[PDB]
Ligand binder design. Structure first.
Ligand SMILES: CC(C)CN(C[C@@H](O)[C@H](Cc1cc(F)cc(F)c1)NC(=O)O[C@H]1CO[C@H]2OCC[C@H]21)S(=O)(=O)c1ccc2c(c1)CC[C@@H]2O
Lengths: 99, 99
């Protein structure tokens, strides 16, 4: 699908058997999701943005189906304002910017 | 131009007669630029992201040539770690996500 940017590029994702909505974010190197309960071992980590830094749990090799496209990569879970699909996963589903 | 997401989607911008590098950010609703001296009237505003909030100056109707494409819109100036081109300007240069 081609997505115009006149509205937020929100897509439906399936992660950990749970359905959520996430923002396709080309400005994010990593995928960060709001508080959710994901299976497996995790590692403490710190990530930064415009306002400063948040402490998140790093989950590796996590399957996500983004708009029907499957990808496995690192997912960070913590107090993000919005679910973000980062470039680590966007490259897996073949996302490109066009203008 | 089509841009892959294996590297940060950085573009060269011309704003206020000044050359800078900016991130094409589909996850940003508005354009936020690092501290610079821009002409015209401004209004204080506060914006939030990952980590908290920063205070910015709202500048309206500013011309920015993003990768050779011209656009006029609101530009926020403040202590952002990186220059980010938000959807308010991406829509003007016809940027779409493709996968
Ligand atoms: C979070 C979403 C909801 C909004 N953000 C857009 C993201 O794309 C953002 C871009 C960014 C911000 C940076 F500080 C540094 C960077 F290198 C890149 N990514 C991000 O923080 O990613 C993180 C996870 O991956 C890591 O890699 C990159 C950083 C780490 S924003 O920047 O907060 C923002 C932009 C405009 C506006 C608002 C807020 C409010 C009004 C205006 O519309």
């Amino acid at each position: 699908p081609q997505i115009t940017l006149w509205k937020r590029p929100l897509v439906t994702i399936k992660i950990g058997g749970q359905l959520k909505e996430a923002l396709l974010d080309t400005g994010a190197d990593d995928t960060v999701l709001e508080e959710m309960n994901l299976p497996g071992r995790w590692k403490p980590k710190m990530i930064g943005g415009i306002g400063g830094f948040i402490k998140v749990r790093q989950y590796d090799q996590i399957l996500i189906e983004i708009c029907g496209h499957k990808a496995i990569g690192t997912v960070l879970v913590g107090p993000t304002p919005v679910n973000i699909i980062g470039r680590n996963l966007l490259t897996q589903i073949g996302c490109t910017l066009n203008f």
